[PDB]
Amino acid sequence: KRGWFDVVDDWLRRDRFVFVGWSGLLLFPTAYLALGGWFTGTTFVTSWYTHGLASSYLEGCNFLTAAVSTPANSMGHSLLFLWGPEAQGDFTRWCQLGGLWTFVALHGSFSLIGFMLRQFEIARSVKIRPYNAIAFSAPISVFVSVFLIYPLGQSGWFFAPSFGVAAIFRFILFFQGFHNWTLNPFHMMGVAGVLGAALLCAIHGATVENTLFEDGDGANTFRAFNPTQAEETYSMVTANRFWSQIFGVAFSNKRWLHFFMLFVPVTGLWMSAIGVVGLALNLRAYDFVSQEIRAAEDPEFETFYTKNILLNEGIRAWMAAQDQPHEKLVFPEEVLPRGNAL
Amino acid sequence: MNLEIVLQLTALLFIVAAGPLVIVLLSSRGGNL
Amino acid sequence: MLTLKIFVYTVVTFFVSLFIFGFLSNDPGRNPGQ
Amino acid sequence: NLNGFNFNQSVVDSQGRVINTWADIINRANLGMEVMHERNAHNFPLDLA
Amino acid sequence: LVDDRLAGEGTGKILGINDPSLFWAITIVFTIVWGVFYVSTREIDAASDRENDDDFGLTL
Amino acid sequence: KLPEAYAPFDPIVDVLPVIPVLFLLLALVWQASVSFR
Amino acid sequence: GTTGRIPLWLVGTVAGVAVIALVGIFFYGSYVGLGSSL
Amino acid sequence: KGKGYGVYRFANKYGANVDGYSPIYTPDTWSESGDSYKLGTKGLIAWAGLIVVLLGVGINLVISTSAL
Amino acid sequence: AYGDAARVFAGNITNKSGFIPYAGEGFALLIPSKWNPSKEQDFPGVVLRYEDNGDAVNNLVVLVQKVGKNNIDELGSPDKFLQDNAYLFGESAAFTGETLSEGGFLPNKVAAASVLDVQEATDKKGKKYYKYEVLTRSADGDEGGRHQLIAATVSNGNLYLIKVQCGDKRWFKGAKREAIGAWDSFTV
Amino acid sequence: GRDQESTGFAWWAGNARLINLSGKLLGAHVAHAGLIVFWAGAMNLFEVAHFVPEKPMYEQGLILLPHLATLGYGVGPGGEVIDTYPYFVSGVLHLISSAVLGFGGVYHSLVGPETLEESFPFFGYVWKDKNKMTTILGIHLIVLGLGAWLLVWKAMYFGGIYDTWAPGGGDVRIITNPTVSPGVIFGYLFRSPFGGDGWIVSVDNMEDVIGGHIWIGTLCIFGGIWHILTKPWAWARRAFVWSGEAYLSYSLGAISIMGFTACCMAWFNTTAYPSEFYGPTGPEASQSQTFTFLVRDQRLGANVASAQGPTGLGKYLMRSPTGEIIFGGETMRFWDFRGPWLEPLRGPNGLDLNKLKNDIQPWQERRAAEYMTHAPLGSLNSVGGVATEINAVNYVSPRSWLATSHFCLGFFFFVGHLWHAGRARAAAAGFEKGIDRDNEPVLSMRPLD
Amino acid sequence: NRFGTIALLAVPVIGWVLFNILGPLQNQLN
Amino acid sequence: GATGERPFSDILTSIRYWVIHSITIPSLFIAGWLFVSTGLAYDVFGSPRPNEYFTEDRQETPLITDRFNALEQVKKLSEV
Numbered sequence A: 001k002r003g004w005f006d007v008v009d010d011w012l013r014r015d016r017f018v019f020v021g022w023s024g025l026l027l028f029p030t031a032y033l034a035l036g037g038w039f040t041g042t043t044f045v046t047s048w049y050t051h052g053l054a055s056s057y058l059e060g061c062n063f064l065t066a067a068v069s070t071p072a073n074s075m076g077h078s079l080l081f082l083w084g085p086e087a088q089g090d091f092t093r094w095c096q097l098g099g100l101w102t103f104v105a106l107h108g109s110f111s112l113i114g115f116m117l118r119q120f121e122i123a124r125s126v127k128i129r130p131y132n133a134i135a136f137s138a139p140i141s142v143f144v145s146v147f148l149i150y151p152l153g154q155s156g157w158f159f160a161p162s163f164g165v166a167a168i169f170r171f172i173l174f175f176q177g178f179h180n181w182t183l184n185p186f187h188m189m190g191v192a193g194v195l196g197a198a199l200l201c202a203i204h205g206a207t208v209e210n211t212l213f214e215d216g217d218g219a220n221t222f223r224a225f226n227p228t229q230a231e232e233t234y235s236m237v238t239a240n241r242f243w244s245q246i247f248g249v250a251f252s253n254k255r256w257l258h259f260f261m262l263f264v265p266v267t268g269l270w271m272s273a274i275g276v277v278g279l280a281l282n283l284r285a286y287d288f289v290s291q292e293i294r295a296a297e298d299p300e301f302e303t304f305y306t307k308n309i310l311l312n313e314g315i316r317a318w319m320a321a322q323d324q325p326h327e328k329l330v331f332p333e334e335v336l337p338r339g340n341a342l
Numbered sequence B: 001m002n003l004e005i006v007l008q009l010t011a012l013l014f015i016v017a018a019g020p021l022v023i024v025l026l027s028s029r030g031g032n033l
Numbered sequence C: 001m002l003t004l005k006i007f008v009y010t011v012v013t014f015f016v017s018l019f020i021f022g023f024l025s026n027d028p029g030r031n032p033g034q
Numbered sequence D: 001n002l003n004g005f006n007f008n009q010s011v012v013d014s015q016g017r018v019i020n021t022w023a024d025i026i027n028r029a030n031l032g033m034e035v036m037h038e039r040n041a042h043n044f045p046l047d048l049a
Numbered sequence E: 001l002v003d004d005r006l007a008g009e010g011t012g013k014i015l016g017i018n019d020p021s022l023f024w025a026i027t028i029v030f031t032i033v034w035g036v037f038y039v040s041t042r043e044i045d046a047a048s049d050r051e052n053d054d055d056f057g058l059t060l
Numbered sequence F: 001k002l003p004e005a006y007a008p009f010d011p012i013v014d015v016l017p018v019i020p021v022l023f024l025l026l027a028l029v030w031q032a033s034v035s036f037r
Numbered sequence G: 001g002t003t004g005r006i007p008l009w010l011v012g013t014v015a016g017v018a019v020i021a022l023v024g025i026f027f028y029g030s031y032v033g034l035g036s037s038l
Numbered sequence H: 001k002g003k004g005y006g007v008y009r010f011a012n013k014y015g016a017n018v019d020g021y022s023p024i025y026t027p028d029t030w031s032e033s034g035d036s037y038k039l040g041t042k043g044l045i046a047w048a049g050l051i052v053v054l055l056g057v058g059i060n061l062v063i064s065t066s067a068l
Numbered sequence I: 001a002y003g004d005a006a007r008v009f010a011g012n013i014t015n016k017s018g019f020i021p022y023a024g025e026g027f028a029l030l031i032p033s034k035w036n037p038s039k040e041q042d043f044p045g046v047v048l049r050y051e052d053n054g055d056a057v058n059n060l061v062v063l064v065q066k067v068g069k070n071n072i073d074e075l076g077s078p079d080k081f082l083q084d085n086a087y088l089f090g091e092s093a094a095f096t097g098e099t100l101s102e103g104g105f106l107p108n109k110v111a112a113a114s115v116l117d118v119q120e121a122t123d124k125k126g127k128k129y130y131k132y133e134v135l136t137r138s139a140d141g142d143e144g145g146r147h148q149l150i151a152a153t154v155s156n157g158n159l160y161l162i163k164v165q166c167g168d169k170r171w172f173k174g175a176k177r178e179a180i181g182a183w184d185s186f187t188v
Numbered sequence J: 001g002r003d004q005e006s007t008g009f010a011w012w013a014g015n016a017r018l019i020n021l022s023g024k025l026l027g028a029h030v031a032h033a034g035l036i037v038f039w040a041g042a043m044n045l046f047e048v049a050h051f052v053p054e055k056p057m058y059e060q061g062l063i064l065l066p067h068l069a070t071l072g073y074g075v076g077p078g079g080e081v082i083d084t085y086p087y088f089v090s091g092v093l094h095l096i097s098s099a100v101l102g103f104g105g106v107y108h109s110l111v112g113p114e115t116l117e118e119s120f121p122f123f124g125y126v127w128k129d130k131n132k133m134t135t136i137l138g139i140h141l142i143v144l145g146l147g148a149w150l151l152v153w154k155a156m157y158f159g160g161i162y163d164t165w166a167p168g169g170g171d172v173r174i175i176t177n178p179t180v181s182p183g184v185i186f187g188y189l190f191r192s193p194f195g196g197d198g199w200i201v202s203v204d205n206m207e208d209v210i211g212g213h214i215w216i217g218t219l220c221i222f223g224g225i226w227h228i229l230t231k232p233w234a235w236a237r238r239a240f241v242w243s244g245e246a247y248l249s250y251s252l253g254a255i256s257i258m259g260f261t262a263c264c265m266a267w268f269n270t271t272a273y274p275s276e277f278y279g280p281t282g283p284e285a286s287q288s289q290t291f292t293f294l295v296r297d298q299r300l301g302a303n304v305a306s307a308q309g310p311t312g313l314g315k316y317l318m319r320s321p322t323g324e325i326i327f328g329g330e331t332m333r334f335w336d337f338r339g340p341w342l343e344p345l346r347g348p349n350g351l352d353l354n355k356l357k358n359d360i361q362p363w364q365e366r367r368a369a370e371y372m373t374h375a376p377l378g379s380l381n382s383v384g385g386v387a388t389e390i391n392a393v394n395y396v397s398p399r400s401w402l403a404t405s406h407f408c409l410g411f412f413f414f415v416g417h418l419w420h421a422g423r424a425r426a427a428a429a430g431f432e433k434g435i436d437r438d439n440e441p442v443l444s445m446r447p448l449d
Numbered sequence K: 001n002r003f004g005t006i007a008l009l010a011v012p013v014i015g016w017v018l019f020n021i022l023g024p025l026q027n028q029l030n
Numbered sequence L: 001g002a003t004g005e006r007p008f009s010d011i012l013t014s015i016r017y018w019v020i021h022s023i024t025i026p027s028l029f030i031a032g033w034l035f036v037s038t039g040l041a042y043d044v045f046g047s048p049r050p051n052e053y054f055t056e057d058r059q060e061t062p063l064i065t066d067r068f069n070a071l072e073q074v075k076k077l078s079e080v
């Protein structure tokens, strides 16, 4: 190794406690900056001038109610650089205008890119297959569709999720009230995928741990294993028979088992991402026209779908005034939908 | 800094310090732990 | 309605008695251990 | 009836006025979906059940 | 009244018995199953190749 | 409230009930000092 | 000069006590001052 | 009762157990230095003086910058 | 920059009375601190309106109307004055129909007001006041009724009136203190 | 102590190293009992020192003091605390006895005999010796029966216990005629658990409680005597697993059932858990709200009986699905509630219209208003009211705390029973450490279809 | 001056660390 | 095995380590306390003090309406 590229590759791809690699140059700075931006925004920066709230520990918020807030709706889809035509180089006023959210999001996306690249590079250095790198595509797609594509199809960054706990809860409730997101088949596939992945994880762990082999004399079975051993540590035949007699069907292929384990959550997350991409343009599966027409013609027809519609209407009407200060909605108390005595 | 709060903190410190004191005393003198 | 109640009571007590007297019939001895 | 955390009107400024928060936005959404969950089943102001 | 009903819900009867026929059904079925089990419990024990002494049973 | 004769000992009472949790933590500390043999 | 080391269990005990005290201070500050609703 | 396997059945075939394969506490690899402080007693005395001074300065600064 | 240090180790609360004084054009009152300004003008002559952060039903409003009489008693008896200004509780003009299925309401009526207390008193200066306390109920019955506190007076040829509204649900839960404090502090 | 080298149990499962060590196990149990008594005494002292007389018991977050109030200690007519000295005495006695118990536990765990089967044959035992285990069970049954009789003696001769249904308001009565009728006792036991019936949670007078305690004391003493003099039969030897972990699993299941029952009793009962010291129950608050709104609207000149609601069912009074006159609204699901302040207005066919039209008392109205405002609703940070309220009230009902905590404990101990029953059944058979590679049971069976 | 106070606080920390670690650091550099 | 760095167990049980780090960690803690208490946190990141949420000019929540004059608008809204 004599060339500049060769010596740089020798140093970068070294055996170390923390592997740097060629992708480290993109991953470490951006990830560090994103983490620091989130911590700084949650600790010191406020949200009074862009949202009308308080979103910092300095103002009296706990871990749940502290967040990094989105810019105002007047800023549209501006990238809000520190040197842009809005902040104009002023750091304090850049923080006050909501520029830390775009900072964190833009650095986090490149950190995700760098992390997948790091997975690829480490897999190639160890001479294995890049299925772990393939599996990260689902989280990356979820992040891209939720934090970038959805706001890019709306009025501005104001309707993006804010980096916080209660902010994400408000985002979820808004998605329920306005989009009827629970009634979306793509979200249903995503929910099925997540719950099935949890089911698979629990059932595989229990089945492996309860079909072990007697390789020791102690009740603590964790010490009867050696990673370099040849024989398998549990009885696949016994597991298959148990699950065939209990459930009806069972796995007989370890490779197929583990590929299914990989396949389920990735597909669920990708389907949910497609659903959110569709929802970015207000293409929401909101209503059933036949049910609406039947309920309109017949004042006796009622199902749970109509009750959900009424709940969404109430959510919209009562959250609109404060959630969207730019619309300047002043609602007299007698126009808000309300039930009897409640 | 109320006097009652100072007394409560003193009592809490005395009670907490009584736990590892036994362990330290038995480990320093090579007791049967 | 009383006939349905009698029939259901008979069925339920039949199955529960089967369960009880089956688990009382030397159940711990039905294992492959040596 | 042991509900979750209630951080409503928790942040208060020097003169006593209320500074809102994401918890308060969530509370507004809850108020929206509360007065409509059963329209005609209530005769009295409190849903004690 | 317009129709008729059992009218027994929310009363507090022993095992829900309002008529002796339910008691008879329960007792008859339980006794039949118990007798069938009682005839065979001697043969079932002998499958363990051990006598039902004071040391019988699954012990550790 | 405690009787007037037991008033000076109120701060002692206010910290008593945490002792069982302290006992669990002390068991963990003893196991750590023994070095988890 | 000064031969000897510090017990790792002692280090762990002190660190645990420190973090527990920090969390307790955080909870106390949640019950009084800013963001205490009164 | 035990069957004579021990902690691991294939201890002779594979050399050792998982514990003997990837330990996380190896005093042999520890540095020869670090078990004795080179600066000795004078260094510890200087450290004690410095920590007392720094604690006093810190408490004074905390009290002064606050609202008493 | 500002240079102001944070109020660390401060044992005093700046405001703890729960009220914020207000100085207007010819009147003064103590507004609850938990309330926010509003941009609604429901009655003629609205010059001030505040509503609670947690519920928009709880609110106060101040009306300064032009009248010919220089004294409050020249507008009629307290009962007659309340009868003339009955629009302050709203009207059921949008409901045009006949019904007989209301709980404790007169036929074809979906709302009613119960005059719980009337009072006439003079301030320290020597200006007469008309004080009212009403409880208006609805056919559906939201909040379990609404409490209206009214204090009216005439000064310099203008009628000064304040109406404080508070839902019953909040009234018996401890929010009557703020409403009564705002009602009793109206000075002209 | 010991180590994994000579035991095979890791440090996180170290209490399993003293399964066959009788002396150390006894020391551990005695130390744990000392811990329980210590908590009881310390919590009683903490609650007695933070009690103000201007607020009711349920408004100050007390859970041990209402237990002593129901025994008639330091309470007066109507449910008002008068003296607070017996609570201090009880707390002091518990705290002092905890020291003796803890010393005994420490001695028996540290320097006492390790295995007391050779020096103390009377106290020594083997887990597989059925006769000795049955003898110990009988001894402890006798002790529990004596405890039940001790409770019975209090309500009869030593001043009695608080009765919330006593004529002229609740007061500390003396129970002279307990109900020892077999039909009454068997009616509570074999009752349905559904609504209206309520199983044993539906006991509505202190005479039934005292009679049932007489029954349970006699039964426990007789069963203890029976077990001391006998040994398990063939049908019992053929059905159970005989090991310490198996016995532990049985006890775990029993106490999980007990915890669930305690949760339900705290949530629903009003006799053994008077509302004067625990606050209103779930249904009680709703009934009180409807009652006070009916009273207020009647004072405003309205016809409550003939008033019609938005749905056409009745705003204040309607009919239960069996015919009884009940309160209207969503509180139509709580018509099984029966409380001391509401019973006097109830006739043979339900609520009496004339009685609530002309004979409603101010004390009843005050009780209804108080139980309406102090409803058992709250949040985790102790904020009273519904989830869409503000930060104004610091209150959570004592019934909610007990109910939630004991449901959690009951569920976790059911899970523990499952774990230990499975492990005992597997270990006794002999395959709790895994499958045998040489002789795998499945390889010897014919394949499925 | 407010930042100057923090810098002046941080100076002795750097001094102490340099005083305690200069030897082995120079050894590692060579 | 080991990648060529001092074991963490060896470092954390060293008199030198605990002599160096008996100064740095408390120094950083005091530095953060002084950063908050001296009012620097409010000024650097522009957060409102409890008395600066509402000014005598406006008693409502701030609202930014212009994208290119946003700097001047937020300068006007933050005026004390």
Ligand SMILES: CCCCCCCCCCCCCCCCCC(=O)OC[C@H](CO[C@@H]1O[C@H](CO[C@H]2O[C@H](CO)[C@H](O)[C@H](O)[C@H]2O)[C@H](O)[C@H](O)[C@H]1O)OC(=O)CCCCCCCCCCCCCCCCC
Pocket (backbone or CB within 6 Å): J192, J193, J194, J195, J196, J197, J198, J199, J200, J201, J202, J203, J204, J205, J260, J261, J264, J265, J268, J269, J270, J271, J336, J337, J338, J339, J411, J414
């Ligand atoms: C022998 C084996 C069993 C045989 C029978 C099995 C039947 C199974 C049917 C299938 C459905 C499952 C069971 C449903 C139970 C519903 C209980 C209920 O509606 O109510 C429960 C009742 C409460 O009864 C209430 O009792 C009340 C008492 O009345 C009176 O109570 C006081 C009396 O002074 C007051 O005066 C009060 O005002 C007055 O109303 C009222 O009657 C109520 O209407 C009545 O509902 O409690 C009780 O029976 C006491 C506690 C019961 C057990 C624990 C219940 C909770 C745990 C559930 C199971 C475990 C879950 C966790 C593990 C999950 C994984 C395995």
Ligand code: CLA
Pocket (backbone or CB within 6 Å): A025, A026, A029, A030, A033, A079, A080, A081, A082, A083, A099, A102, A103, A104, A106, A107, A110
């Ligand atoms: C490691 C890689 C890295 C990457 C990929 C990013 C990425 C980004 N940063 Mg971050 N940043 C980093 C490290 C990095 N940063 C570091 C180390 C710091 C110092 C703390 C910052 C501080 C920072 C700030 C202060 C801001 C950003 C922001 C942004 C955006 C910049 C937009 C822009 O126009 O770029 C510049 C455009 C380019 C295309 C550059 C490439 C040009 C090539 C190399 C040609 C070179 C030719 C040129 C004519 C000759 C130069 C050579 C000669 C001078 C020697 C972008 C998302 C902004 C933000 O997020 O706004 C919301 C912003 O405000 N960053």
Ligand code: CLA
Pocket (backbone or CB within 6 Å): B022, B026, B032, B033, F024, F027, F028, F030, F031, J001, J002, J003, J010, J011, J012, J013, J014, J015, J016, J017, J018, J021, J024, J025, J027, J028, J029, J031, J032, J099, J102, J103, J106, J109, J110
């Ligand atoms: C509920 C409380 C509790 C109790 C009573 C016990 C009881 C027991 N444990 Mg278990 N244990 C517990 C929880 C508990 N454990 C927990 C939570 C864990 C997980 C960390 C373990 C893990 C564990 C292990 C790994 C081992 C035991 C063993 C033992 C037994 C032997 C004691 C000994 O040799 O070392 C005692 C050691 C010391 C000398 C420390 C003394 C400190 C004293 C006892 C503190 C209490 C004093 C108090 C402050 C003042 C009382 C004095 C009085 C006058 C007031 C002892 C009976 C050992 C065993 O299996 O024996 C065969 C053993 O190997 N336990």
Ligand code: CLA
Pocket (backbone or CB within 6 Å): J141, J185, J186, J189, J219, J220, J222, J223, J224, J226, J227, J230, J231, J232, J233, J236
């Ligand atoms: C501390 C609790 C307790 C425990 C754990 C045991 C445990 C045991 N008992 Mg003992 N027993 C007790 C108290 C207890 N008993 C009391 C209080 C009495 C007096 C009634 C008896 C009388 C007794 C007899 C007569 C017999 C046992 C037997 C046994 C063994 C069989 C297990 C079994 O129950 O089968 C599992 C349970 C069943 C299949 C169903 C039982 C559920 C009953 C039928 C429910 C209805 C209750 C019943 C009709 C009683 C009337 C109710 C009441 C209001 C009067 C087991 C060792 C047997 C033995 O081996 O003796 C040596 C036996 O024949 N016990």
Ligand SMILES: CCCCCCCCCCCCCCCCCC(=O)OC[C@H](CO[C@@H]1O[C@H](CO)[C@H](O)[C@H](O)[C@H]1O)OC(=O)CCCCCCCCCCCCCCCCC
Pocket (backbone or CB within 6 Å): C012, C016, C019, C020, E008, E009, E010, E011, E012, E013, E015, E016, E017, E018, J189, J190, J191, J192, J193, J197, J257, J260
């Ligand atoms: C107690 C002996 C147990 C032996 C072993 C049993 C093993 C398990 C067997 C299966 C059990 C589950 C299925 C049961 C189905 C039949 C019962 C049924 O449906 O009844 C349903 C019926 C309902 O009866 C109704 O009654 C009404 C009037 O009240 C009307 O008459 C209705 O028409 C009638 O249907 O209820 C009963 O029969 C009452 C059962 C009471 C049982 C008391 C048990 C006391 C001893 C045990 C105490 C602890 C119990 C557990 C508590 C904690 C639980 C978390």
Ligand SMILES: CC1=C(/C=C/C(C)=C/C=C/C(C)=C/C=C/C=C(C)/C=C/C=C(C)/C=C/C2=C(C)CCCC2(C)C)C(C)(C)CCC1
Pocket (backbone or CB within 6 Å): A032, A033, A035, A036, A037, A039, A040, G019, G023
């Ligand atoms: C913004 C920005 C930037 C950056 C910065 C940075 C990078 C920073 C960082 C920062 C950081 C880096 C921070 C951190 C912080 C942290 C914290 C604050 C922590 C906390 C913690 C806690 C609180 C814990 C807790 C706990 C416990 C105790 C127990 C267990 C569990 C847990 C762990 C959770 C710059 C200048 C470049 C540029 C411009 C912009």
Ligand SMILES: CC1=C(/C=C/C(C)=C/C=C/C(C)=C/C=C/C=C(C)/C=C/C=C(C)/C=C/C2=C(C)CCCC2(C)C)C(C)(C)CCC1
Pocket (backbone or CB within 6 Å): B015, B016, B018, B019, B020, F012, F016, F019, F022, F023, F025, F026, F028, F029, F032, G009, G012, G013, G015, G016, G017, G020
């Ligand atoms: C009543 C009374 C009393 C008594 C008391 C007592 C009895 C006490 C006890 C106490 C105790 C008994 C204590 C204890 C404590 C403990 C602790 C405090 C611990 C802690 C720990 C931690 C914090 C951590 C840990 C760890 C380790 C070590 C390892 C692993 C990891 C961790 C980190 C977890 C007295 C005398 C006062 C007198 C008066 C009265």
Ligand SMILES: CC1=C(/C=C/C(C)=C/C=C/C(C)=C/C=C/C=C(C)/C=C/C=C(C)/C=C/C2=C(C)CCCC2(C)C)C(C)(C)CCC1
Pocket (backbone or CB within 6 Å): F006, F009, F012, F013, F023, F024, F026, F027, F030, J031, J032, J034, J035, J038, J045, J092, J095, J096, J098, J099, J101, J102, J103, J105, J106, J109
């Ligand atoms: C063995 C063991 C263990 C355990 C232990 C235990 C569990 C113990 C306990 C113990 C105990 C459980 C103890 C107790 C004690 C107590 C005491 C010591 C008390 C005292 C008291 C007093 C002193 C009082 C006083 C007073 C009075 C008289 C009146 C009022 C006021 C007052 C409160 C001041 C462990 C875990 C470590 C592990 C290892 C082994």
Ligand SMILES: CC1=C(/C=C/C(C)=C/C=C/C(C)=C/C=C/C=C(C)/C=C/C=C(C)/C=C/C2=C(C)CCCC2(C)C)C(C)(C)CCC1
Pocket (backbone or CB within 6 Å): C019, C020, C021, C023, C024, J184, J185, J188, J189, J200, J203, J208, J209, J211, J212, J213, J215, J216, J239
């Ligand atoms: C005090 C009182 C009273 C009374 C009470 C009583 C008298 C009770 C009794 C109770 C009883 C008397 C109970 C019993 C129970 C039982 C049980 C719970 C059983 C169980 C069993 C089992 C679980 C079994 C099993 C099995 C089978 C089935 C098969 C084979 C195997 C075995 C054996 C394992 C009253 C309520 C009046 C009132 C209030 C108070």
Ligand SMILES: CC/C=C\C/C=C\C/C=C\CCCCCCCC(=O)O
Pocket (backbone or CB within 6 Å): E017, E018, E019, E020, E021, E023
């Ligand atoms: C040969 C004589 C010997 C023993 C017979 C003794 C007693 C028989 C008693 C009763 C049998 C019928 C039981 C009926 C139970 C109640 C039924 C109901 O509630 O309707």
Ligand code: OEX
Pocket (backbone or CB within 6 Å): D037, D038, D041, D047, D048, D049, J330
């Ligand atoms: O039903 Mn179903 O949801 Ca239980 O809360 Mn009340 O009621 Mn009705 O309302 Mn809300």
Ligand SMILES: [Cl-]
Pocket (backbone or CB within 6 Å): D041, D042, D043, D044, J328, J329, J330, J331
């Ligand atoms: Cl209702």
